[PDB]
Structures are given as C-alpha cells and as structure tokens.
Amino acid sequence: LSATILTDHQYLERTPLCAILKQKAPQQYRIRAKLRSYKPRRLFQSVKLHCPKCHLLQEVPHEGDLDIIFQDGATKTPDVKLQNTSLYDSKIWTTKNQKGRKVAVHFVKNNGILPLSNECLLLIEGGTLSEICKLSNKFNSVIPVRSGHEDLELLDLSAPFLIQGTIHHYGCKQCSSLRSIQNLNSLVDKTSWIPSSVAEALGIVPLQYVFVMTFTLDDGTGVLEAYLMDSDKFFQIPASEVLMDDDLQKSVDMIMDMFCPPGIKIDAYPWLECFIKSYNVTNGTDNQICYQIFDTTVAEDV
Ligand SMILES: [Zn+2]
C-alpha cells in the first residue's frame, strides 16, 4: 500500500536514500520512503504566493490585512476628469450609507457597447473591502483602481489586481512594471477576462498559489529532506481555492494525517514513493544538495 504514485518516469527503479546522499547534483531519482515528519504542520501556512520569475514566496493576505489596505483608499478623491472615456462608462457612488472618498465604478465597454451584469469587468475607485466584496458578488470581474494623475491606476500590488467572485489574483511587486488602466483597451476579448491577459495588459507578472512543504523522508536506509512546491497536482487540491474552503483544507489535513499519522509509530506509516530532483545550492562555504518532489500525486483516496 503506497500512499503516493509516480505520474511519469515509471520505468525508473527505486534508489535507496544512502546512495542519493553520496551522489552529485543535479540528478533525478525514484524513491520509496516514509514521511517521518513535515513542516509546516500548520497547513494553513503551507499556502504561499509564488512568482514564476523572481521565485519569491510571500504570504497570502488575510481579510484583516486586506481590510487595512483597502480602507485607506488613496491620496485623493476620484478625479471626475477620468470618467466616461473611450474605454469605460462611469457611475459615481456616494457617501450615502456608503463609505470612503467617493466610490466610482467604471464599466469597461465591450468595444462600444456596455455589457450586462453577467459578463462585465468593473474598476472600483476608493472602495472599502466590504464594498468590493458586494460588487464582486454581482459582477464577474473587479479591479481595484485609484485616481492617479493622467489616468486611473491600480490601487496597490499588495491588494489583488483582479477579483473574480471569490478568487483573488495577485501580482509580483518586484517583477511587475505597472501600466496605467487605459492599456486595458488592448484586450482582444472584452466579454470574458482571464488573469493572464489582464495582467500582461497592465504589465503585471501574476503570482501563483502553491503548497510549500518540507517532507522529511526515511526508508530506514537514510533520511532526506525533500521540498514540495505544488499548485494542484500532488494533493489534487487547488491551492488557489484551499485557503477558503473548509472541506478542501480538511481533505488535505486528512492526507497529511494519512502519510504521517499522530500517535502512530513509523512501522505502520504508509510508503510514499516519489520522483525527486536534486539541485545545487551555495549553502555557506560548503555545498548542500536540496531535493524537490516532481511528477508525484496521491493515490486513489479522497
Ligand atoms: Zn517576481
């Protein structure tokens, strides 16, 4: 009974960990070990934001953090000058049982024609998080913007650059070169918006949700630490949706408890067979070899 299986390179035979620790990097192996321990055991913390370029890892903002970022609004009132362009028709909200500077909403055109409420992109100006949450509940896509000087500009990259219902898309604060909002006119399709096109139209390098864990693997032959950076292949659970779904995180809780069950000794632990790759690092004056799991998924059990 193996807990994980290989999704590729199955022709490979198993290599014991004693051999791997003695060898060079980079190389790839097939192993079969037991999960002695894992970090972080707080699985709410294992979900991070990853940039495919700078390779940074940052935490996912809590609703409290997102509250403070949005509550500030910006440095000025929404410039009435920047309304009803050749890109969006605008409606200004009030402070009338509503809060903020002045909540302005800009419905980007479907190239001349306004959309309905079912497939429309919204630019909201100086809105609190609660106002953004209600509007993202009614419309498909929402972007937090702010009045700059010559054009609307994104609020801040610490806030999501695109909100589609309950999914929050973030960008890299160091690899991105923010373009002003008018560049959204270069979008081909103006009825459906995916984050890749929106981010590039705005010069944003989109972050990716990832599980980040360090498995301590032991086959009795030796002990090895393997990194897991995964979207949705390993656990077969989307990391972009696990942080907000009580069942998703529970079934991930249950997979870790299956690999490394508390109160149980290592004999009853199930075998994890994985495909790992080694790579070099200049860890101090010496030389470390780190290991990462690839092409490995959990076996058939929910
Ligand atoms: Zn980056």
From Swiss-Prot:
Tissues expressing the protein: Ubiquitous.
Compartments it resides in: Nucleus; Chromosome, Telomere
Phenotype for residue 292 to H: In TPDS3; increased telomere intensity signals and telomere fragility
Domain of life: Eukaryota
Transmembrane segments: none
Known partners and oligomeric status: Homodimer or homooligomer. Component of the shelterin complex (telosome) composed of TERF1, TERF2, TINF2, TERF2IP, ACD and POT1. Binds single-stranded telomeric DNA as a monomer. Associated component of the telomerase holoenzyme complex. Found in a complex with TERF1, TINF2 and TNKS1. Interacts with TNKS1. Forms heterodimers with ACD. Identified in a complex with ACD and single-stranded telomeric DNA.
Reported disease: Tumor predisposition syndrome 3: An autosomal dominant disorder characterized by an increased risk for the development of various types of benign and malignant neoplasms throughout life, with age-dependent penetrance. Affected individuals can develop neoplasms involving epithelial, mesenchymal, and neuronal tissues, as well as lymphoid and myeloid cancers. The disorder is associated with elongated telomeres.
Family listed: Belongs to the telombin family.
Described purpose of this protein according to its UniProt entry: Component of the telomerase ribonucleoprotein (RNP) complex that is essential for the replication of chromosome termini. Is a component of the double-stranded telomeric DNA-binding TRF1 complex which is involved in the regulation of telomere length by cis-inhibition of telomerase. Also acts as a single-stranded telomeric DNA-binding protein and thus may act as a downstream effector of the TRF1 complex and may transduce information about telomere maintenance and/or length to the telomere terminus.
Identification of the protein by name: Protection of telomeres protein 1
Origin species: Homo sapiens
